[PDB]
Amino acid sequence: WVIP
Amino acid sequence: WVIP
Amino acid sequence: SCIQFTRHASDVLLNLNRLRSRDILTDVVIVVSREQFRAHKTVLMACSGLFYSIFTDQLKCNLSVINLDPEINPEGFCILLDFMYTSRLNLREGNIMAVMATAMYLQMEHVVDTCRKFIKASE
Amino acid sequence: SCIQFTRHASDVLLNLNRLRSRDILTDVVIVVSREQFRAHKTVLMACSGLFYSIFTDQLKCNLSVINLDPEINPEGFCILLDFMYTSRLNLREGNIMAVMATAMYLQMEHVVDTCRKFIKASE
Ligand SMILES: N#Cc1cnn2c(Nc3ccc4c(c3)CC(=O)N4)cc(Cl)nc12
Ligand SMILES: N#Cc1cnn2c(Nc3ccc4c(c3)CC(=O)N4)cc(Cl)nc12
Ligand SMILES: [Cl-]
Ligand SMILES: [Cl-]
Numbered sequence: 001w002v003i004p
Numbered sequence: 005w006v007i008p
Numbered sequence: 009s010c011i012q013f014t015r016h017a018s019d020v021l022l023n024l025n026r027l028r029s030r031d032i033l034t035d036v037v038i039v040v041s042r043e044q045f046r047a048h049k050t051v052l053m054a055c056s057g058l059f060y061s062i063f064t065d066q067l068k069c070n071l072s073v074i075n076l077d078p079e080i081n082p083e084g085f086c087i088l089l090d091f092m093y094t095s096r097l098n099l100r101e102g103n104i105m106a107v108m109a110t111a112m113y114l115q116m117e118h119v120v121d122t123c124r125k126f127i128k129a130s131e
Numbered sequence: 132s133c134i135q136f137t138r139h140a141s142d143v144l145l146n147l148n149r150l151r152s153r154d155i156l157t158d159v160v161i162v163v164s165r166e167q168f169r170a171h172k173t174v175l176m177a178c179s180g181l182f183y184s185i186f187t188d189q190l191k192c193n194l195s196v197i198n199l200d201p202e203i204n205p206e207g208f209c210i211l212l213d214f215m216y217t218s219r220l221n222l223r224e225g226n227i228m229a230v231m232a233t234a235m236y237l238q239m240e241h242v243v244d245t246c247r248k249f250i251k252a253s254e
Contacts, residue, residue: 001122004096004135005245008012008219009221013241016218017140020147023177032187033173050156050171054146064155095139098132118136 018095024051025093038089039075043082045089055092057115077113084110091119099126141218147174148216161212162198166205168212178215180238200236207233214242222249 027033027048034046049069052059062068076085084106091097097119099107108123150156150171157169172192175182185191199208207229214220220242222230231246 001097001118001134001136004133005011005013005220005241008010009223010219011222011245012219013214013245014218016214016241017144020174020177020215021140021143023183024143024173027173027176033176033192048173050147050150050173051143053150053156054143060146069156091136091139092143095137096133096135099134100132118139122134122136 021093021095024048028093035072037073038085039073040080040082040085041078043085045085047089047092051092055114055116057117058113060115080110080113081106088114088116088119091116097122099123101130144216144218147171151216158195160196161208162196163203163205163208164201166208168208170212170215174215178237178239180240181236183238203233203236204229211237211239211242214239220245222246224253 028046028051031046034048036047036049036052038045038047038052049059049063053063054060062074068074083103087098087103087107088110097107099122104123104126108120108127111119111123151169151174154169157171159170159172159175161168161170161175172182172186176186177183185197191197206226210221210226210230211233220230222245227246227249231243231250234242234246
């Protein structure tokens with residue numbers, strides 16, 4: 001999971 | 005396009 | 009000896025979400041209490057262990073309407089349906105419990121994982 | 132303020148290809164001379180300007196069989212259909228001309244681009  |  | 013186009017899968021998913029927004033080739037309505045959500049069975053199966061089981065069933069595969077358990081929260085479902093079609097999860101303090109419960113019911117293991125990690129960090 | 136699962140789009144496409152291999156929820160046969168290819172209309176539209184136009188048409192949207200131009204090569208189509216469902220393009224000296232012609236007909240601009248670049252490098 002990432003900060004887009 | 006890339007070499008996978 | 010294939011070559012691979014990096015952005016292809018993202019581009020496909022973007023167009024599947026455009027089809028959903030325009031209600032093109034949607035073949036099922038998911039009923040969550042008083043709310044209805046139109047979707048493509050193929051995308052639901054591709055994202056959810058629950059829908060994969062439902063739509064591989066020789067009788068349920070032909071249904072145009074699927075009713076979810078009355079304990080399922082419509083907003084939690086809406087957030088997960090948007091995630092299915094975009095890879096983006098609108099996870100907030102106010103919705104995390106509903107999102108995690110919905111993801112457990114829908115069998116969306118990666119979403120459950122992250123909800124668990126975000127909850128563990130706040131305690 | 133969304134979070135994003137990096138591998139989600141690739142995972143969706145992998146499951147759409149699994150559905151295709153098992154012939155689950157395929158809703159169209161593409162006829163290319165003597166050969167037939169089963170697919171999902173939603174994936175074809177998401178990858179191809181030609182199928183996007185065909186399946187948004189108020190009459191053609193309901194057809195279960197689509198016949199391509201007799202000049203279209205079945206192997207070239209097969210290679211492009213595999214690309215649609217996997218992001219991988221089996222581009223070879225022996226098939227590049229057929230793949231490029233098929234990609235131009237199907238309006239798959241990124242494939243046409245690369246075929247053009249690979250041909251330019253060999254001349
Ligand atoms: N054919 C086919 C096909 C269509 N969909 N699909 C799967 N869909 C699925 C099943 C379980 C889970 C998820 C997705 C996300 C998750 O957390 N669990 C799996 C397989 Cl093995 N195959 C297929
Ligand atoms: N709704 C919808 C929807 C479904 N599919 N789709 C598009 N599919 C497409 C159209 C043109 C081209 C390609 C894909 C690859 C290419 O080279 N050209 C576009 C839009 Cl703007 N919208 C949609
Ligand atoms: Cl997931
Ligand atoms: Cl393309």
